[PDB]
Each structure stands twice: as structure tokens, then as C-alpha cells.
Amino acid sequence: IPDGYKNEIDQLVKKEFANITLFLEEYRRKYPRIDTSRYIPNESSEVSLLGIVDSYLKHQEIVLDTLLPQTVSNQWRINNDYIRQTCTIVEEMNIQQRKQINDLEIYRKR
């Protein structure tokens, strides 16, 4: 009985039981360390010149040189093909485990 004998035996087993890094782990408490929230805002009228040039121009020039297209979609789709080779390998192992698992149960059945 998948509802009586298991419940019965469980009670009998129950009755016999009645008889018988520092920085990382601390951050886990649930707060990430704040980063530099400075570069994005700034102010023309406000304080500090370096922020204008020591924050925005050079990074924007590096951005415009970095922000690209020369290769475009070819570099992306080349990596997409690699992901498909990686995926099929896992499912082949899913099969190999599936066959040997059923094979062991098959021997028990006899």
C-alpha cells in the first residue's frame, strides 16, 4: 500500500527513534559594497573639473573607439555556434546515464 503499510512501518521506525572569506561571508548578510556613483551625473556649474575630463571625455572617446561593429554580428554568431557544440555534448551524457540506469534496473527485475 502506497498509503497504509508505509505509514504503518514509518510509525514503527519512529518508535525506535523515540527510544534512541571574511569580507565575502560578511557581505552575504545582504549588502553589496557601493561603487563609484560619480562619473554619470557631474555638473557644469558644480565643483570639480577633473570629473569633466578626469571622468567623461577620455572614457567617451574610449567608448566610441570600443563601441563597435567592424566585425558586427559575425563575431557573435561565431560564439553562438560554439554554444550549440557545448549543449549537445551534455544531452549525449544524459542518454548514456539513461541507458545504464535502465540497464541496472533491468538486471534487478529478473
Partner: peptide, 18 residues
């Protein structure tokens, strides 16, 4: 030089540290 010195290099040492 600007983002490469400031934004990109900052993120690389953040990504390594955390």
C-alpha cells in the same frame, strides 16, 4: 584613454576582487 583609464580598468579590478 579616458574610459580605458577610468571606467574599463576600474571594472576589471572590481570583477577580479569580488
Amino acid at each position: 584613454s579616458i574610459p580605458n583609464l577610468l571606467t574599463s580598468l576600474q571594472n576589471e579590478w572590481d570583477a577580479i576582487m569580488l
